[PDB]
Write a protein that binds this ligand. Structure first.
Ligand SMILES: [Zn+2]
Lengths: 129, 25, 96, 206, 32, 87, 115, 97, 217
RNA sequence: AGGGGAUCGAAGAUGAUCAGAUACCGUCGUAGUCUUAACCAUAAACUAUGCCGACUAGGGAUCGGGUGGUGUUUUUUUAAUGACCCACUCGGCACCUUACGAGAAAUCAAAGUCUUUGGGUUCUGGGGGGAGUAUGGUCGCAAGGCUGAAACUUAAAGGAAUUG
């Protein structure tokens, strides 16, 4: 059975981006999926997504625009402190000038740059580049 | 040697080891 | 996937699996079982003093053809009769 | 962007319909679903002759405005196409490989048949798939008169006609020659028809 | 024959036959 | 990319496929650049001014190059009704 | 048996390719031509060259070869290609039901029949 | 390696089938194996059609046929030329000649 | 006295094409090697490995020699050539020919803040050629090249200065290790970057521009 | 243990064959092959491919169910029904082309989505032997099964494919 809906969403996005499609359909939905795709959209990696709201969990269609090399989830959500963010970004970002590590922080879901600025840490969730 | 007959040879050796153990207590 | 457990509270299973596989490993098993002390001809030592019991000439292995001319010695601290190769030329004549 | 004279011209539409280009094959294929209009009973699919017409016009835009007109190449091995590609070769620049392709004609610079084109036209991709592969090796765009059940791999802009009709193949080659001439500039007064006539492009038995 | 240092063997022979045609040229110039 | 003074580095910017927005490699010997004619009044295609498209070897290999060029021709007005957005 | 080899076939095809107007249909004349327009070094080989040349010329004057082509052959093959026939009206267009549905969906005059 | 994708002959969703016996050696070979041919012959074969027609009462009645379903094992079929060794690409073809 | 055979050779002999940069930009097929003989002066070589290879015949044992060589100038262009020949000098020569046919560029980059003429790679990249993965990680300034000596010489001929290389698989096969590094250089240029997110007016095909001097004589 | 015992048939009796033939071949023939009640718990028990879940490529057949057809054939005047045809769909056993990818390769629509390394979870492996051996335990009427080393020894053993 479905253990990580974000992992299923990110696998679908990654597979269709490798295939070269311009859009994906993601089932089912979550607050964390919507907020993660919102961080993606704010940094410009994706285009525009629509949330189809049936009375079940719902679906998303995402209109991509290229420029998303790989999106991945880190299962399990690891308790990362403020001094291990640099270890994690060195481990799984390609270069130190681009790419974002997305943290599930008590101030919200955001990338490691906003985490460094707001001086707050949490559970590492995923990564985009 | 074929492994089947190797298994059979070790089987005879196991029987004889058990017999000689029972013989000498 | 990948077989190993990945959950956040699985570190007990990870430790148990690691201990069993370390027992499968060669050097770790030798060290913990202590075959250096239980079954080694030395007492886990680098060197050992023995005394020569005999001078034995043993043939080489194929394809080499020579007589290696080692000695048979008895260890003082254990009593285990071992066989030691005599080094470079004429030292067999040196050793009585 | 195209002006009003680049439409169907019903006077050319009866040429299409009388040459029976509208029929397709029994298999659809996923890259040719948009070209299929409807499924006639007794297992025939009809091809949108309108859609073939604007794909032909677009292919005319590709084939014309190549600055040296001879570097265009025309590939044929179907027995229903050699006369058509030779006539297209006569009217336009269009170096012809009517006949055998000699694998190694676009690479392998020491062959006598060594052509380095800038645009290929293929009469049939399934029966001429060697030339499409070689163009894929050496960076050449491909025009093809594909079918519904045609290989769409390694091929650019395609015009779905029949590839089973002698009249279809000949008339589509003729129409393409018409429009590349009328865009490059031998024939003016676009309302007027052409003096050369399609049964010239149609082949004989021998 | 030595399969593993043929590169140096042939380069040395290259220098040698270049030298031999050089003394051929020198002998031709000395005779002429 | 740049340096501290804004002086250009990256000896060549890569070309991007106009279908999938992916970098066209130097070794990509299937990727083709198509120069479509610019038609003014009654043909007369002006030499040197072409509407340009670039297709990548991946798009051609998967065989959706025809669909992509239908879409791009309709986006730039080369064609009117050849590609339907809703299949 | 009497199978001609690559030497005679290659030389005969090159000579026939570039010397078609001067060549004749007879062996004696053709072998004198080979003597003059070829610096061949063997007499029996020369006779073999001329014999295959004559046989290939017989086949050329009877019809086209798939091995080689000419400028006169190019002129005659063009003219036989632009032989032009008459037009392929029977009143209206032929029987049409759902392609007639296609033509009325697109919109054109197109006077046609039904099936 | 794996010579065949069918592992010799097709089972694909059974696990076990009842075996038959070969007709030349009586080897027990499974039914999905054991090359099966149909022998459709005449009792009154062509060397004697005219003989039996000229020596038979009931003029032009019929000519009977013999029907046999022959199971050959792999060794017996290879030895007795029913089946032939093939090349690597020709093993994939499964159309009768 | 070289003579062109192809349109690209005709253009570069005419001298209107003045750089491998528009060559690699328009992804033109390199079929001759004199084009970058004229266009890339000071393209020095290094033969990496000479290795005998044996085919067992009816009675003899036919031994050919396999030469793997590299070429590079000093900055950002590498070619890798493999040739098999009966004579090893001819193998080296034709390997130089093949490496010039297979010259490709690199994406040099920075480890941190952009200061003074990039030193390392752009992104963490990888290359796999036959159970050898060679992974190139950018490194800070002055750390040098850490690699096996063959990969180190390949990257020195590339002109990068600061690389960490990890490698897995049987790295003792020099041909596969060099091919994996070559694919890693290619993928280093092939990666997409937020610097490259911008849109360019798309180039204009110098063969099309200069087709009249590219025509037949 | 009891019943049944036709065929085939370990062991065996013979006749061949061979330098030898208590092997292959031929004749018989014990246990067994069948069954009732108890055991045993092993197989190349093999798809040599853990189970659950998602995505990624086209096609044509087939099994079971379902939907649509001013379709075909049947009664005795053509409706129902059944069977067949076409289109679609769900769930199966599979199959063909390609390689987008994967692989050391053979090959694989999964053995893909794996150095751009993290969906959940269980078991197993750490060069070849010694060895599935010795010992100890437990189950078994036994046959044996499950668990299971070390000393010592060796520089290879092996996988795929190519040329002879
Ligand atoms: Zn048999």
């Amino acid at each position: 059975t479905r253990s990580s809906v974000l992992a299923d969403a990110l696998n679908a996005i990654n597979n269709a981006e490798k295939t070269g499609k311009r859009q994906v359909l993601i089932r089912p939905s979550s607050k964390v999926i919507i907020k993660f795709l919102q961080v993606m959209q704010k940094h410009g990696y994706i285009g525009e997504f629509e949330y189809i709201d049936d009375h079940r969990s719902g679906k998303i269609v995402v209109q991509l625009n290229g420029r998303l090399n790989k999106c991945g989830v880190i299962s399990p959500r690891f308790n990362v402190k403020i001094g291990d963010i640099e270890k994690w970004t060195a481990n799984l970002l390609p270069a130190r000038q681009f790419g974002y590590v997305i943290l599930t922080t008590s101030a919200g879901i955001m990338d490691h740059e906003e985490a460094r600025r707001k001086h707050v840490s949490g559970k590492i969730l995923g990564f985009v580049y | 040697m074929r492994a089947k007959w190797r298994k059979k040879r070790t089987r005879r050796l196991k029987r004889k080891r058990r017999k000689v153990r029972a013989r000498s207590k | 996937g990948k077989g190993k457990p990945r959950g956040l509270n699985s570190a007990r299973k990870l430790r148990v699996h690691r201990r069993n596989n370390r027992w499968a490993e060669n050097n770790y098993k030798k060290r913990l079982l202590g075959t250096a002390f239980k079954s080694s001809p030395f007492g886990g030592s680098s060197h050992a003093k023995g005394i020569v019991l005999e001078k034995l000439g043993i043939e080489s292995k194929q394809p080499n053809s020579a007589i290696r001319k080692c000695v048979r010695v008895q260890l003082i601290k254990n009593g285990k009769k071992v066989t030691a190769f005599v080094p470079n030329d004429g030292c067999l004549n040196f050793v009585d | 962007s195209l002006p009003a004279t680049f439409d169907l011209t019903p006077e050319d539409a009866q040429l299409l319909l009388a040459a029976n280009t509208h029929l397709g094959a029994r298999n659809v294929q996923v890259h040719q679903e948009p070209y299929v209009f409807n499924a006639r009973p007794d297992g025939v699919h009809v091809i949108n002759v309108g859609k073939t017409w604007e794909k032909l016009v677009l292919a005319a835009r590709i084939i014309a405005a190549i600055p040296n007109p001879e570097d265009v190449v025309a590939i044929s091995s179907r027995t229903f196409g050699q006369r058509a590609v030779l006539k297209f070769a006569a009217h336009t620049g269009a170096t012809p490989i009517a006949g055998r392709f000699t694998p190694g004609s676009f690479t392998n610079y020491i062959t006598r048949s060594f052509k380095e084109p800038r645009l290929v036209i293929v009469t049939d991709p399934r029966s001429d798939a060697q030339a499409i592969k070689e163009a894929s090796y050496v960076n050449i765009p491909v025009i093809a008169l594909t079918d519904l059940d045609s290989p769409s791999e390694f091929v650019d802009v395609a015009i779905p006609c029949n590839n089973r009709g002698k009249h279809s193949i000949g008339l589509i080659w003729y129409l393409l020659a018409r429009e590349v001439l009328r865009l490059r500039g031998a024939l003016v007064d676009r309302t007027q028809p052409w003096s050369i006539m399609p049964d010239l492009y149609f082949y004989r038995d021998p | 024959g030595d399969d593993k240092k043929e590169l140096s063997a042939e380069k040395e022979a290259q220098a040698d036959a270049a030298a031999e045609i050089a003394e051929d040229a020198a002998e031709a110039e000395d005779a002429g | 990319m740049e340096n501290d003074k804004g002086q250009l580095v990256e000896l060549y910017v890569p070309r991007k496929c106009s279908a999938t927005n992916r970098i066209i490699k130097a070794d990509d010997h299937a990727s083709v650049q198509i120069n479509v004619a610019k038609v003014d009044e009654e043909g007369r295609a002006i030499p040197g001014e072409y509407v340009t498209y670039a297709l990548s070897g991946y798009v051609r290999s998967r065989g959706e190059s025809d669909d992509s060029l239908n879409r791009l021709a309709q986006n730039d007005g080369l064609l009117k009704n050849v590609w339907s957005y809703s299949r | 048996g009497r199978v001609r080899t690559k030497t005679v076939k290659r030389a005969s095809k090159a000579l026939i390719e570039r010397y078609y107007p001067k060549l004749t249909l007879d062996f004696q004349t053709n072998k004198r031509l080979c003597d003059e327009i070829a610096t061949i070094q063997s007499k029996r080989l020369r006779n073999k060259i001329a014999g295959y040349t004559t046989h290939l010329m017989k086949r050329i004057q009877k019809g086209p070869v798939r091995g080689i082509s000419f400028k006169l052959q190019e002129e005659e093959r063009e003219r036989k290609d632009q032989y032009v026939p008459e037009v392929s009206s029977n009143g209206v267009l032929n029987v049409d039901n759902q392609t007639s549905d296609l033509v009325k969906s697109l919109g054109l005059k197109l006077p046609l029949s039904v099936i | 390696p794996k010579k065949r994708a069918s592992n010799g002959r097709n089972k694909k969703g059974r696990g076990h089938v009842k075996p038959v016996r070969c007709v030349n050696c009586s080897k027990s070979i499974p039914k999905d194996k054991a090359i099966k041919r149909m022998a459709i012959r005449n009792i009154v074969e062509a060397a004697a059609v005219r003989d039996l027609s000229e020596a038979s009462v009931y003029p032009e009645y019929a000519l009977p046929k013999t029907y046999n379903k022959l199971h050959y094992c792999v060794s017996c079929a290879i030895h007795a030329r029913i089946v032939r060794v093939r090349s690597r690409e020709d093993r994939k073809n499964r159309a009768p000649p | 006295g070289w003579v062109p055979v192809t349109k690209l050779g005709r253009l570069v002999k005419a001298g209107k094409i003045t750089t491998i940069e528009e060559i690699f930009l328009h992804s033109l097929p390199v079929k001759e090697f004199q084009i970058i003989d004229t266009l890339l002066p000071g393209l020095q070589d290094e033969v990496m490995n000479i290795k005998p290879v044996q085919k067992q015949t009816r009675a003899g044992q036919r031994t050919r020699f396999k030469a793997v060589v590299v070429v590079g100038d000093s900055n950002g262009h590498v070619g890798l050539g493999i040739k098999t020949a009966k004579e090893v000098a001819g193998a080296i020569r034709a390997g130089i020919i093949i490496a010039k046919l297979s010259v490709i560029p690199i994406r040099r980059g920075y480890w941190g803040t952009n200061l003074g003429q990039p030193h390392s790679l752009a992104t963490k990249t990888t290359g796999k050629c036959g159970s050898v993965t060679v992974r190139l990680i950018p490194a800070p300034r002055g750390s040098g090249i850490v690699a096996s000596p063959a990969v180190k010489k390949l990257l020195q001929l590339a002109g990068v200065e600061d690389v960490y290389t990890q490698s897995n698989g049987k790295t003792r096969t020099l041909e596969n290790t060099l091919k994996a590094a070559f694919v890693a250089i290619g993928n280093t240029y092939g990666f997409l970057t937020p610097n490259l997110w911008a849109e360019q007016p798309l180039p204009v095909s110098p063969l099309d521009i200069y087709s009249d001097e590219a025509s037949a004589q």
